[PDB]
Amino acid sequence: SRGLVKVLFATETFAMGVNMPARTVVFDSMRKHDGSTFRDLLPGEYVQMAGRAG
RNA sequence: UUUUUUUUUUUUUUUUUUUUUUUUUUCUCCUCUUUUUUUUUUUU
């Protein structure tokens, strides 16, 4: 919140919705693990994690 | 190459009182033998 930490590593517990967005967001993978079907992401998810950068 | 969420030890306290040991039965009941009754007295 105070900007004293630069690089953050977080799972979906912090991804899909937050206020106070930083400037840049990066993705290290294309897939995700839902409840034992091992699907990929959908636009409803990509909008929320990546829709908060400004 | 396996993420996200599912609360926990019932609330209450700042009510008066002018009595006194016990406690409640048992029925009428043939007394055998020398006597009048002796007696002063003195030594404690």
Curated annotation (Swiss-Prot):
Similarity-based family: Belongs to the helicase family. SKI2 subfamily.
Name this protein carries in UniProt: Superkiller complex protein 2
Span within the parent record: 652 to 705 of 1246
Location in or out of the cell: Nucleus; Cytoplasm
Coiled-coil features, chain-numbered ranges: none
Encoding gene, per UniProt annotation: SKIC2
Disease: Trichohepatoenteric syndrome 2: A syndrome characterized by intrauterine growth retardation, severe diarrhea in infancy requiring total parenteral nutrition, facial dysmorphism, immunodeficiency, and hair abnormalities, mostly trichorrhexis nodosa. Hepatic involvement contributes to the poor prognosis of affected patients.
Function: Helicase component of the SKI complex, a multiprotein complex that assists the RNA-degrading exosome during the mRNA decay and quality-control pathways. The SKI complex catalyzes mRNA extraction from 80S ribosomal complexes in the 3'-5' direction and channels mRNA to the cytosolic exosome for degradation. SKI-mediated extraction of mRNA from stalled ribosomes allow binding of the Pelota-HBS1L complex and subsequent ribosome disassembly by ABCE1 for ribosome recycling. In the nucleus, the SKI complex associates with transcriptionally active genes in a manner dependent on PAF1 complex (PAF1C).
Signal peptide bounds: none
